[PDB]
Design a protein around this ligand. Structure first.
Ligand code: MOO
Length: 326
């Protein structure tokens, strides 16, 4: 057996090889797909299509007939035992009762947060972080490393970490003169007036591409806000996650939103599939997503940056297919 330390700082003993993992978190699932580890998985969170988007199955068709013995915050132990799993990956904020259900039937559990940060916050859905940039940078690298070790994908893990961060220098250099008063005020609109505030990767993706998350000063993590909040914030640009494409026509056809600066300016954009401004960092969101948003908002600073090729090279390497725009 092997002992690892997971992202809740739990020491976990696992078999020397894993071939029957159950992955109850979409972030770790997308990593495992990019580590070419799916033949070693036999169940996944039951809300995988919602959380990954309806087109995710294109990149991992093997997910379609995958068993679903739990989701992010619940598990069905009788369904889970029939799969004969050798490990379950859970999200960092999985309730203690759920982790205990799985530990009580002697199946190892590995909690993934993709964040370091303050120890007392490691289990919290919406953390308070004194250095969120460092916590998410180091946490994405530590997380990818951990998932790759469990699946014995070390070399591809190392390549995935190096790819995630390969463009950060370009953006730091090209956008280093953007002052706080000029940074582009941007808002992430999720279904049902949901947004992300502080302690999340969303605002980091915006910062690295010369923008600022208008909600992050007053909202903590992922919350439902009111229409009045968004009118007050009056963002210049509204972004929608690719997995929730219905949110764009919703906003565009909603008279209550019409006087917001982004509406008036026709700056309501569905982000690409790779450009995940999610509450958790994903390697493609750093590598490709931040470059997309930087080019969208400062096109005249990036004309030499062939993003189509960057995206193709990345997709052929980690998803073993081309990118397909929707
Ligand atoms: O799907 Mo998330 O919780 O926005 O990373």
């Amino acid at each position: 057996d092997r002992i690892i330390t997971d992202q809740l700082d739990r020491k976990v003993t696992i078999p020397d090889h894993i071939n029957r993992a159950v992955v109850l978190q979409h972030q770790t699932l997308n990593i495992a797909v990019q580590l070419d580890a799916t033949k070693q998985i036999v169940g996944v969170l039951s809300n995988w299509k919602k959380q990954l988007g309806k087109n995710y199955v294109r990149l991992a068709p093997e997910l379609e007939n995958m068993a679903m013995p739990g989701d992010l915050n619940s598990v069905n132990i009788e369904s889970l035992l029939a799969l004969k799993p050798d490990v379950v990956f859970v999200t960092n904020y999985a309730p203690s009762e759920m982790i205990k259900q799985i530990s009580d039937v002697n199946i190892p559990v590995v909690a993934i947060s993709l964040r370091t940060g303050e120890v007392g916050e490691k289990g919290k859905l919406n953390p308070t972080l004194t250095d969120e940039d460092k916590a998410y940078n180091d946490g994405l690298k530590q997380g990818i490393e951990l998932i790759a070790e469990v699946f014995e994908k070390k070399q591809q893990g190392d390549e995935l970490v190096k790819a995630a961060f390969a463009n950060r220098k370009l953006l730091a250099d090209r956008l280093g003169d953007v002052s706080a008063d000029k940074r582009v005020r941007t808002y992430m609109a999720n279904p049902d007036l949901g947004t992300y505030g502080s302690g999340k990767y969303t605002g980091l993706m915006m910062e690295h591409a010369g923008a600022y998350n208008v909600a992050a000063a007053t909202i903590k993590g992922f919350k439902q806000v009111s229409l009045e909040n968004v009118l007050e914030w009056n963002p210049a640009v509204i972004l929608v996650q690719d997995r929730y494409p219905d949110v764009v026509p919703q906003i565009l056809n909603d008279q209550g939103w019409a006087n917001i600066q982004a509406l008036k300016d026709k700056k309501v954009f569905l982000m690409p599939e790779y450009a995940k401004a999610w509450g958790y960092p994903m390697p493609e969101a750093l590598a490709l997503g931040e470059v997309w948003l930087a080019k969208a908002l400062y096109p005249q600073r990036f004309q030499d940056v062939d993003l189509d090729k960057m995206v193709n090279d990345y997709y052929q390497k980690f998803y073993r297919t081309s990118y397909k725009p929707d």
